[PDB]
Each structure stands twice: as C-alpha cells, then as structure tokens.
Amino acid sequence: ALLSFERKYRVPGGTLVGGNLFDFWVGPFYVGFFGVATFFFAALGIILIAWSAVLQGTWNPQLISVYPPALEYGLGGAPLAKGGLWQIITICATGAFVSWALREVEICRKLGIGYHIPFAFAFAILAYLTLVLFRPVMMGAWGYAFPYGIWTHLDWVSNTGYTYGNFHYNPAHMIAISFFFTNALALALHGALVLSAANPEKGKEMRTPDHEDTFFRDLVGYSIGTLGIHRLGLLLSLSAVFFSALCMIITGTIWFDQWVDWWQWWVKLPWWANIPGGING
Amino acid sequence: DLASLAIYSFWIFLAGLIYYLQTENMREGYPLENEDGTPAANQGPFPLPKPKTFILPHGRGTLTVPGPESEDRPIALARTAVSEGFPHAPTGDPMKDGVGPASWVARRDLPELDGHGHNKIKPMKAAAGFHVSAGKNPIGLPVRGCDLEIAGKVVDIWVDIPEQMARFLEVELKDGSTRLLPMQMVKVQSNRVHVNALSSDLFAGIPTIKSPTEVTLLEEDKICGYVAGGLMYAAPKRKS
Amino acid sequence: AEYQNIFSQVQVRGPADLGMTEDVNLANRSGVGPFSTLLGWFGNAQLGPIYLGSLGVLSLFSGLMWFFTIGIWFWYQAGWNPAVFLRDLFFFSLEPPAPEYGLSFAAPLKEGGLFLIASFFMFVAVWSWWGRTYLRAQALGMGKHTAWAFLSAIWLWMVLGFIRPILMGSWSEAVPYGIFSHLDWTNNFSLVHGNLRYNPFHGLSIAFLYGSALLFAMHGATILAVSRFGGERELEQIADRGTAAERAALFWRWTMGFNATMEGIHRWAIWMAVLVTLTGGIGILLSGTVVDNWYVWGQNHG
Numbered sequence: 001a002l003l004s005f006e007r008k009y010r011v012p013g014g015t016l017v018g019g020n021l022f023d024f025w026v027g028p029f030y031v032g033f034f035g036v037a038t039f040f041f042a043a044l045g046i047i048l049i050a051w052s053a054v055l056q057g058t059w060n061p062q063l064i065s066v067y068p069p070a071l072e073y074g075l076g077g078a079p080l081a082k083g084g085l086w087q088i089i090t091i092c093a094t095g096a097f098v099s100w101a102l103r104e105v106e107i108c109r110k111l112g113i114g115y116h117i118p119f120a121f122a123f124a125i126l127a128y129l130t131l132v133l134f135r136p137v138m139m140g141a142w143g144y145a146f147p148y149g150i151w152t153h154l155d156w157v158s159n160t161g162y163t164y165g166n167f168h169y170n171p172a173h174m175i176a177i178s179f180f181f182t183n184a185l186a187l188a189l190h191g192a193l194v195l196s197a198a199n200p201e202k203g204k205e206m207r208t209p210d211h212e213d214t215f216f217r218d219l220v221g222y223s224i225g226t227l228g229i230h231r232l233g234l235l236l237s238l239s240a241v242f243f244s245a246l247c248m249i250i251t252g253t254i255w256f257d258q259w260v261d262w263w264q265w266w267v268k269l270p271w272w273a274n275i276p277g278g279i280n281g
Numbered sequence: 282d283l284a285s286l287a288i289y290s291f292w293i294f295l296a297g298l299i300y301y302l303q304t305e306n307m308r309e310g311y312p313l314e315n316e317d318g319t320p321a322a323n324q325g326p327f328p329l330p331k332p333k334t335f336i337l338p339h340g341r342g343t344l345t346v347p348g349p350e351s352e353d354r355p356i357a358l359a360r361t362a363v364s365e366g367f368p369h370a371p372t373g374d375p376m377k378d379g380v381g382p383a384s385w386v387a388r389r390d391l392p393e394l395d396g397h398g399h400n401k402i403k404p405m406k407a408a409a410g411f412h413v414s415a416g417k418n419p420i421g422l423p424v425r426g427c428d429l430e431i432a433g434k435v436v437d438i439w440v441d442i443p444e445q446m447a448r449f450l451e452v453e454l455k456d457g458s459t460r461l462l463p464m465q466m467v468k469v470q471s472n473r474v475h476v477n478a479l480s481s482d483l484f485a486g487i488p489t490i491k492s493p494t495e496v497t498l499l500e501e502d503k504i505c506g507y508v509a510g511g512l513m514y515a516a517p518k519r520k521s
Numbered sequence: 522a523e524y525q526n527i528f529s530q531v532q533v534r535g536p537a538d539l540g541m542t543e544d545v546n547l548a549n550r551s552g553v554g555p556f557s558t559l560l561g562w563f564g565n566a567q568l569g570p571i572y573l574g575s576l577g578v579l580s581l582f583s584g585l586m587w588f589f590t591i592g593i594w595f596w597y598q599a600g601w602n603p604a605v606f607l608r609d610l611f612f613f614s615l616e617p618p619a620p621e622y623g624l625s626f627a628a629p630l631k632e633g634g635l636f637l638i639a640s641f642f643m644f645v646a647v648w649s650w651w652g653r654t655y656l657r658a659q660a661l662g663m664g665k666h667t668a669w670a671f672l673s674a675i676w677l678w679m680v681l682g683f684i685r686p687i688l689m690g691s692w693s694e695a696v697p698y699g700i701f702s703h704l705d706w707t708n709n710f711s712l713v714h715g716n717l718r719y720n721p722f723h724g725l726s727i728a729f730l731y732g733s734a735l736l737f738a739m740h741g742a743t744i745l746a747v748s749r750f751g752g753e754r755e756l757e758q759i760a761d762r763g764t765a766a767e768r769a770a771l772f773w774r775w776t777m778g779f780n781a782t783m784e785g786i787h788r789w790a791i792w793m794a795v796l797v798t799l800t801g802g803i804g805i806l807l808s809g810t811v812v813d814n815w816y817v818w819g820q821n822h823g
C-alpha cells in the first residue's frame with residue numbers, strides 16, 4: 001500500500017549495486033542490494049543464535065547468552081561451542097549494520113536528500129565496533145568483548161566498570177554522560193517548543209517561529225533558531241557516542257589502574273601539592 | 282507489592298501512549314492506497330484519529346487533518362510491471378514534470394509570513410539594514426554548473442528576515458532573467474559559486490517566480506524540487 | 522565536495538529583533554545584547570533581549586544564594602587558601618545533616634544546617650524558574666508544553682533531595698553538594714539497594730536516555746537532509762505539507778516500514794525525553810521506602 005503522496009517518488013534509480021535488479025519494494029519496505037544483504041546476514045545470525053541456544057540447553061530468551069572466546073584463545077579462532085559462534089555472529093552483526101547503512105544511502109539517492117541519516121548511524125556502528133573489535137584487538141583477546149544476552153551483557157557492564165573501581169571517574173565518561181543528559185534536555189525543549197507553537201491556548205491562531213524565538217529570548221536571553229536546534233541535536237547525540245567510544249577505547253589499554261587515581265595528576269601539581277589544609281593535605 | 286503494581290501500570294500506560302502517538306502520526310498520508318489511487322484493503326490495526334483543526338495566522342483560514350487528500354496535479358509516470366511494488370517510470374522529462382527526486386507539492390501559492398504579517402523571505406536589496414556580516418559575500422560571483430561551465434552570476438541574496446539567514450541566491454543568466462537557487466545546494470568559493478546538482482544548460486529550466494520581490498510556498502517547492510532532481514537526472518553531464 | 526549545512530557559509534545581519542509583543546509587559550524586557558559572529562556560524566547571532574520580572578529576579582537571586590552558600594563552605598574547607606581551593610575543588614562537599622537529626626532543622630550550621638539553607642534557596646530558585654516557564658508561554662499565547670516537560674525533570678530532582686529523604690525520615694538521605702561526592706553518593710545508593718541494575722524503572726530510564734539520543738540523531742539528521750527543501754520551517758510544513766515533509770516521511774517508511782508527520786515527530790520527541798526522568802523518579806522513590814534490595818525483589822516478583 002502507498003501513502004497518498006507516495007507514488008510520484010517511487011521511480012527507478014539511485015542504487016549503488018545491481019542496477020535495477022533489486023530496485024523494488026515489498027509493502028512499505030525498500031529492498032535494494034543491501035536490503036538483500038541485510039536479510040542474509042540477519043537470518044544467518046539468528047540461526048547461529050538458535051543453534052547456540054540448543055548447545056546451552058535453554059530456549060528461554062532471557063537466559064540465552066552467546067559468550068566470546070575465553071581469554072586464553074587470544075585473538076585466534078575458537079571451537080564453536082566455546083566462542084567461535086560468538087565470533088561468527090559478530091561478523092554477521094557487523095555485516096547487517098553496515099548493509100543497513102548502505103541501504104539508507106540508496107534510499108537517500110532515490111529521494112534526492114542529504115546523507116546525514118546514514119552518516120549519523122555510522123557513529124552507532126563505530127561504538128559497537130569499539131566494544132567487540134577495536135578494544136579487544138588492542139587488549140589482545142576477544143574475551144574482553146561483551147556477551148550476547150539480554151541480562152548477561154549487563155553483567156559485563158558492571159564487571160568491566162568495577163575492574164577500574166568506580167567508573168564514574170573516567171574523565172571521557174564524564175563528558176559522554178554530559179552530552180547524553182544535555183541531549184535529552186534539548187530534545188524535550190525542542191519537542192515542547194514546536195508543539196506549544198502549533199497547539200496554542202484554546203481558540204488562538206497557530207504561533208509562528210518568531211514566537212518560538214521570542215519565548216526563548218524572554219526565558220534565557222538567547223534562541224539558537226530553527227535550523228540551529230536541529231544541528232545541535234545532531235551534534236549532542238553524535239558527541240555523546242563519540243565520547244562513549246573514547247572512554248572505552250582508552251580503558252584497559254593506555255589506562256588500566258583505578259580511574260579515581262588518575263585525578264592525582266591534578267592534586268600533586270608542584271605549585272600546590274604540599275600546601276597544608278583542604279581535603280588533600 | 283507496590284513496586285509490582287507500579288511497573289505493571291507503567292507497561293499499560295506505555296501501550297496506550299504508543300497507540301495515541303501512532304494515531305497522531307497518521308494525520309497526513311492516510312488512508313493508504315493501491316498504486317492506482319484507490320483505498321487499500323488493509324489499513325493496519327490503527328484507526329484514523331478524530332480530525333483536529335489548526336487556525337492559521339493572518340486570516341489565512343483553517344487546516345483540518347486528517348482530511349480529503351489529493352495531489353492536485355498530474356503525475357507523469359507509468360507502471361513498469363504487472364504487479365505491485367516496482368518502480369514507476371517517468372513518461373516525459375522528470376525534471377520538467379516534477380516527479381521522482383524532482384518532485385514538488387502543491388502548497389499554497391502564497392508567501393510564508395513572519396509573526397507581524399510581512400513576507401518572511403525577501404531579496405536583500407529590499408530588506409532595510411540587512412548586509413553580509415561574515416563569510417564570503419557571493420554577490421557578484423560567477424555561478425558554475427556541474428559541467429564546469431559558467432551559467433550566470435549572483436545578483437542578490439534572498440534572506441529570511443525573522444531568522445536572519447540567507448535562503449537563496451538570485452542568479453542572472455545569459456538572457457538577463459533571474460532564477461533562485463537554494464543556499465543549501467550551492468558551494469560558495471573564493472572566486473565562484475559552485476552548483477553540483479545542475480549542469481549549465483539546466484539553469485534556464487529552473488522554475489521562475491511571478492513577482493520579483495517575493496516567493497510563494499508553491500514556488501519554493503518547485504524550485505527546490507527541480508534543483509535536488511538534478512543530482513539524479515543531470516548525472517550524465519556531471520564531470521567528476 | 523558537497524555542502525552539508527552543519528555550519529553556515531555566509532552570515533547575514535539586520536536590525537536587532539525585539540520580538541513579538543502579544544501580552545508581554547515590555548517594560549520588563551532588557552535591551553538587545555551584542556551580536557555573536559561565532560555563534561552565528563551554527564545558529565542565531567543575536568544575544569538578548571531577556572525578560573526579567575519579579576519571578577525572574579527572585580529565581581536569579583535564590584539561585585546565586587544557593588551557589589554562593591556552597592561556595593563559601595568550599596572556601597572554609599579550603600582554609601581560605603586560593604591554591605587549596607583550586608587544588609581540591611572537586612573534592613569539597615557540603616553534606617546533609619547526620620542521621621541523628623532526623624528531619625529537624627536543629628542541626629548546627631557546620632554540620633548540615635548550612636546544607637538545608639542551600640537547599641531552601643535551591644528549592645525557591647527552581648520552582649520560581651518553573652513558574653517563569655509557564656508565564657512566559659502564557660504571555661505569548663503558547664501551549665504549556667515547556668512547563669509540563671520541565672516538571673518531569675523537577676520530579677526526579679524533588680524525589681532525590683526532598684520527597685525520598687522525607688519518606689525515609691531523615692535529611693541524611695539527600696544528595697550532597699559536591700562534584701566527586703555526588704558521584705560517590707550515586708555509586709553508594711546502588712550498592713546499598715542491592716544494585717540498581719535490578720530496578721526495572723532504572724532499566725526503562727536507560728532505554729529512554731539512549732532512545733533520546735537515537736531519536737534526536739534521527740530527527741536532527743532528517744531535518745538537515747531535507748533542509749534543501751525548507752525542512753526546518755516545521756510550523757509551516759505542519760500547516761501546509763511540502764516536499765520536505767513528504768521525503769522525510771518516505772525515507773523512514775522505506776527504511777523501517779512506518780513514519781511520522783512533521784507535528785507527530787515532536788510528540789514522539791517530547792515523550793521519549795520526559796519518560797527518562799519520569800520512570801527514573803519512580804524507581805528512586807521506591808528505593809529504600811518500599812524495596813530495600815532490588816535483587817531480592819526481583820527473585821520473587823519476577
């Protein structure tokens with residue numbers, strides 16, 4: 001079925017691979033070569049997870065867990081039942097994510113729009129790759145990656161963090177959290193603003209962008225503007241994931257001690273390290 | 282206990298919220314249609330919301346959605362297959378016809394207004410006090426198309442008054458007439474304005490405006506559609 | 522190279538805009554601040570004007586009193602030495618009264634009395650600011666969405682420093698005013714309650730926080746992608762749908778099978794964000810009042 005205004009946009013072209021071969025839709029869904037690649041990688045990955053579930057002796061969804069090879073295998077292959085499945089599923093996951101992005105590129109070309117969506121999504125992919133590929137390779141074993149399970153991946157979060165004490169002390173993690181909280185702040189305000197203009201007090205006419213700018217200047221003395229808030233939302237979000245990836249890439253590699261102790265470089269700066277008083281003297 | 286009651290309640294609230302949200306997002310484009318324009322059999326499990334009405338500013342009327350919908354323009358395309366789901370090929374010139382990535386919507390043929398009731402966008406020459414405050418001033422630069430040929434020169438900047446931003450470059454062609462180019466589709470360089478979406482012979486085809494000091498929503502859509510359309514349709518003439 | 526619209530290529534400036542009048546008492550609006558070329562490459566160059574009425578002055582005054590009260594205490598703990606102040610800035614902390622003082626205000630200044638003073642100022646600062654967000658919208662004839670959304674953030678803040686301490690019977694349960702100490706309090710609160718990873722509201726809260734970034738990345742990128750058709754002029758695209766709104770919708774329909782409208786995406790946005798502190802405040806409120814250990818609670822109820 002089509003949205004009432006959709007037919008004019010469903011023309012041939014924009015594909016990156018295959019010419020017109022996969023240039024078609026299935027209901028609402030655009031296919032393309034990458035829609036086919038995505039299905040392949042996703043189906044295979046799901047099969048391997050099912051298979052992993054039989055060898056684990058449970059079909060319970062919140063018990064299933066696919067673990068990476070143990071540290072002793074380093075960065076080499078591992079028997080299926082002992083981490084090789086995890087290795088293959090990871091190749092499949094990566095294949096699917098990348099394929100999804102490329103399928104986004106083909107939709108962009110057909111529609112004549114900018115490539116910002118796929119670009120932004122690539123930041124999420126990079127975060128994923130940082131945890132299952134870059135950090136593990138740099139550290140020397142696949143075992144440092146997180147396991148594929150609903151609750152077990154959370155155990156890995158706590159166990160990894162606590163290996164360095166209170167993870168709140170990683171300076172890159174602080175910045176990342178700041179972008180996350182700031183992002184939610186900006187999203188709520190943005191949503192609220194536009195809606196407050198489109199849905200004014202009962203019986204009044206729709207407000208205008210000028211009322212939006214005015215509301216914000218009245219309140220805090222500044223309005224970033226309609227274009228600017230969209231650029232900001234984009235930046236905040238991407239920055240949060242960039243700093244997240246960074247906070248983890250440097251943990252276990254350039255820094256492997258307790259994160260609280262890293263802050264001593266500041267306390268023991270020559271010009272104040274020995275002055276009595278305060279908390280650190 | 283109390284925590285279990287709270288979480289269970291929360292999941293019920295969430296399901297109602299998603300239901301409300303999805304229905305609010307069906308206010309345009311529905312009901313779904315078959316490729317021939319008739320109502321599709323299967324509309325999905327969510328019903329169309331009760332209509333709501335927006336009172337438009339400056340005596341422009343009302344808008345009630347969902348409402349009866351139509352393209353309100355001819356669509357020059359034809360089927361390429363006997364079954365649903367394949368592409369529809371342009372029957373003439375897609376740029377001219379306004380289809381595909383060259384598509385435009387039949388918006389009102391009135392200019393967008395600011396909060397005071399004046400035209401939101403105006404040529405800089407008619408906007409008292411407005412000047413280029415930073416960056417390279419494009420006014421006076423030659424405009425180059427993707428074929429690397431010069432198609433004209435910049436004679437003005439159309440600015441959004443309320444938002445204080447440059448929205449279009451007004452370019453003059455060989456014949457002395459002008460055309461608007463969206464600021465988002467040009468690259469301002471030190472000795473020229475570069476336009477990747479169109480080759481030099483396609484500039485004349487850019488839709489023209491009625492009044493020389495104002496642009497309607499309908500014209501912005503035609504102009505912006507046509508320019509974006511060149512990324513696909515002027516491709517043969519693009520160099521590298 | 523193709524232009525992305527992340528930064529403007531050319532800036533344009535005109536007379537300062539004093540804004541819409543509607544029912545705003547103009548005597549209370551300052552004059553226009555300077556224009557910022559720096560800011561103008563990303564958004565608007567204009568600074569000011571600002572509206573500063575009674576509620577605004579009150580809020581700004583309490584706000585500073587709150588900040589200054591914590592600040593002198595930091596000076597005090599630093600032994601008035603500037604070098605020690607800068608050195609140990611993140612380590613200082615204005616802590617709540619000890620558990621023995623319960624919910625009373627008897628606590629000696631140096632042992633939590635000053636904490637309550639700072640909190641009182643913070644309470645007025647924030648609530649007056651909330652009243653301000655409601656009133657500034659009213660004066661312009663706008664809906665109250667901003668005030669309602671702000672109220673969701675206030676809910677978490679209220680639970681953490683007011684409601685939960687009250688229900689537990691002591692001000693010692695409140696968050697301390699310090700950089701490193703409020704982090705330590707955060708880690709400690711989880712340990713003491715059997716690990717928040719077992720609190721279902723905490724996990725929901727996380728899903729909305731992550732969802733908020735996913736959603737704004739999606740939304741932000743969509744709008745820049747269709748800005749070549751005037752996409753960021755959302756109010757007019759709502760009133761009279763253009764090709765920007767149509768290709769924005771179709772991108773997503775073709776990608777994931779469904780789509781939003783230009784107005785509808787803002788409803789998804791406001792709820793995604795607000796649900797973060799809504800669920801969060803519920804999860805914290807229930808901690809130690811009704812549920813002592815989340816791990817324990819989860820082995821039974823679930």
Ligand code: BCL
Pocket residue numbers: 168173174175177178179181182185678681696700701703704707
């Ligand atoms: C949610 C669970 C915990 C908690 C867990 C964490 C964790 C974990 C982290 C923070 C981080 C921060 N938290 Mg905390 N935080 C809590 C509740 C609060 C409250 C509150 C009134 O309830 C406040 C004011 C803060 C304040 C802060 C900032 C110091 C810092 C960045 C916040 C931010 O970017 O917002 C975005 C908003 C804006 C951009 C607007 C204002 C921005 C500035 C920074 C406002 C700060 C207020 C003021 C007190 C700054 C002190 C200045 C000193 C002179 C340095 N937290 C609760 C108790 N918070 C991060 C950090 O860096 O700690 C050092 C961090 O990693």
Ligand code: BCL
Pocket residue numbers: 046128131146150151153154157723724725727728729731732735
């Ligand atoms: C990001 C930092 C840590 C991490 C820390 C946490 C913490 C801490 C928490 C989660 C939580 C969640 N995480 Mg995790 N998580 C990580 C990496 C991942 C990856 C991944 C491939 O990288 C995935 C798919 C998930 C998936 C999930 C969801 C099961 C759950 C809700 C997230 C959400 O709403 O997000 C935002 C996105 C949306 C709102 C869009 C909807 C996305 C849906 C819900 C994802 C479901 C997919 C899932 C069921 C598995 C796919 C199965 C295959 C199709 C077969 N996490 C890394 C290792 N994650 C929360 C939880 O409740 O777990 C029980 C939780 O508290």
Ligand code: BCL
Pocket residue numbers: 097124125126127128130131156157158160161162166167168173176177180241243244245246247248707
């Ligand atoms: C006890 C645990 C420690 C701790 C240890 C860690 C550890 C360990 C990690 C973090 C990481 C993070 N922590 Mg920490 N953290 C703690 C306390 C906090 C607090 C808090 C208020 O106290 C906060 C706010 C945070 C905040 C954060 C974020 C900055 C960051 C997670 C987001 C992210 O990386 O996304 C990135 C997004 C993704 C990886 C998702 C990628 C999705 C992919 C590309 C697509 C999925 C497709 C899906 C399968 C399809 C489904 C299809 C259909 C829907 C089914 N932490 C405590 C102190 N923190 C994580 C991080 O930084 O990772 C880089 C990390 O690994």
Ligand code: BCL
Pocket residue numbers: 157181184647674675677678681706707708709710711716717718722723726727728730797798800801802804805
């Ligand atoms: C070791 C610690 C525990 C833990 C302990 C806690 C505790 C304790 C809490 C959270 C909370 C949260 N945690 Mg946790 N958390 C852990 C692991 C994680 C992980 C992770 C990767 O595993 C993640 C992603 C998170 C993520 C999150 C958030 C979803 C949530 C806070 C939302 C928020 O926006 O607050 C930021 C927003 C606010 C605090 C509201 C502030 C509003 C006020 C009104 C602002 C005042 C401003 C003031 C006037 C200053 C002005 C300055 C300006 C310059 C003017 N946690 C581990 C397991 N987490 C909170 C919660 O909701 O849990 C249910 C909370 O209390």
Ligand SMILES: CC[C@H]1c2cc3[nH]c4c(c3C)C(=O)[C@H](C(=O)OC)c4c3nc(cc4[nH]c(cc(n2)[C@@H]1C)c(C(C)=O)c4C)[C@@H](C)[C@@H]3CCC(=O)OC/C=C(/C)CCC[C@@H](C)CCC[C@H](C)CCCC(C)C
Pocket residue numbers: 181182184185188189192219220580581582583584585588646647648650651654667668670671672673674794795797798
């Ligand atoms: C829905 C969830 C999110 C959310 C939403 C949200 N927050 C909001 C709102 C909304 C919808 C508002 O409307 C409101 C706002 O008005 O935004 C602009 C607010 C807001 N959220 C704020 C911050 C904030 N929000 C946070 C969180 C979140 N808010 C969530 C993620 C956090 C976190 C993450 O910790 C913070 C820190 C404020 C910007 C604003 C409310 C401001 C307020 O209440 O003001 C108090 C008044 C004061 C004057 C305090 C002054 C204190 C000093 C630090 C001023 C500077 C001192 C100076 C440097 C000294 C000068 C020396 C002298 C000689 C002058």
Ligand SMILES: CC[C@H]1c2cc3[nH]c4c(c3C)C(=O)[C@H](C(=O)OC)c4c3nc(cc4[nH]c(cc(n2)[C@@H]1C)c(C(C)=O)c4C)[C@@H](C)[C@@H]3CCC(=O)OC/C=C(\C)CCC[C@H](C)CCC[C@H](C)CCCC(C)C
Pocket residue numbers: 038041042045046089092093096097100104117118120121123124147148149150151153237238241731732734735738739742776777
């Ligand atoms: C960079 C900023 C943020 C962001 C942005 C972002 N995400 C995006 C996009 C953008 C712009 C998209 O365009 C794309 C999208 O289509 O959304 C609808 C996407 C998307 N983000 C998604 C999820 C997601 N994004 C997340 C995060 C974030 N996304 C950031 C916070 C998270 C987090 C926070 O956890 C999740 C869960 C998807 C909804 C969607 C991409 C969907 C997709 O890639 O489909 C291809 C894959 C499949 C159909 C399934 C493959 C199955 C595998 C082969 C096997 C399973 C393996 C897996 C590792 C299991 C893990 C189990 C877990 C319990 C750990």
Ligand SMILES: COC(C)(C)C(=O)C/C=C(\C)CC/C=C(\C)CC/C=C(\C)CCCC/C(C)=C/CC[C@H](C)CC/C=C(\C)CCC=C(C)C
Pocket residue numbers: 588589591592593595596637640641643644678679680681682683696697698699700703
């Ligand atoms: C440069 O030096 C000078 C002196 C000039 C300065 O001014 C420097 C000042 C600084 C160094 C100040 C530093 C301030 C901090 C670093 C601030 C950090 C604060 C936190 C991280 C706060 C986090 C959380 C706080 C919360 C959750 C507070 C909640 C408060 C309440 C909900 C209010 C409750 C009300 C109370 C209990 C009183 C009720 C009484 C009634 C009568 C109603």
Ligand SMILES: CCCCCCCCCCCC[N+](C)(C)[O-]
Pocket residue numbers: 219220221551571573
């Ligand atoms: C903390 C978020 C909002 C605070 C920003 C308000 C800035 C105050 C501006 C003071 C200048 C005003 N004055 C006195 C000249 O009118």
Ligand SMILES: CCCCCCCCCCCC[N+](C)(C)[O-]
Pocket residue numbers: 293294296297298301
């Ligand atoms: C199944 C019944 C669930 C009851 C709650 C349903 C959630 C309603 C969503 C809020 C409605 C929004 N609105 C229009 C007031 O903004």
Ligand SMILES: CCCCCCCCCCCC[N+](C)(C)[O-]
Pocket residue numbers: 028299303324325326778779
């Ligand atoms: C967490 C968000 C979950 C999204 C769920 C929304 C349901 C999608 C249903 C849309 C079906 C509409 N359609 C194709 C009939 O138009």
Ligand SMILES: CCCCCCCCCCCC[N+](C)(C)[O-]
Pocket residue numbers: 720721722723724725728732792793
């Ligand atoms: C408004 C958007 C709705 C998105 C809803 C996403 C919910 C994801 C499910 C998280 C499951 C959490 N848990 C463990 C706390 O129950």
Ligand SMILES: [Fe+3]
Pocket residue numbers: 190194230740744755
């Ligand atoms: Fe928007």
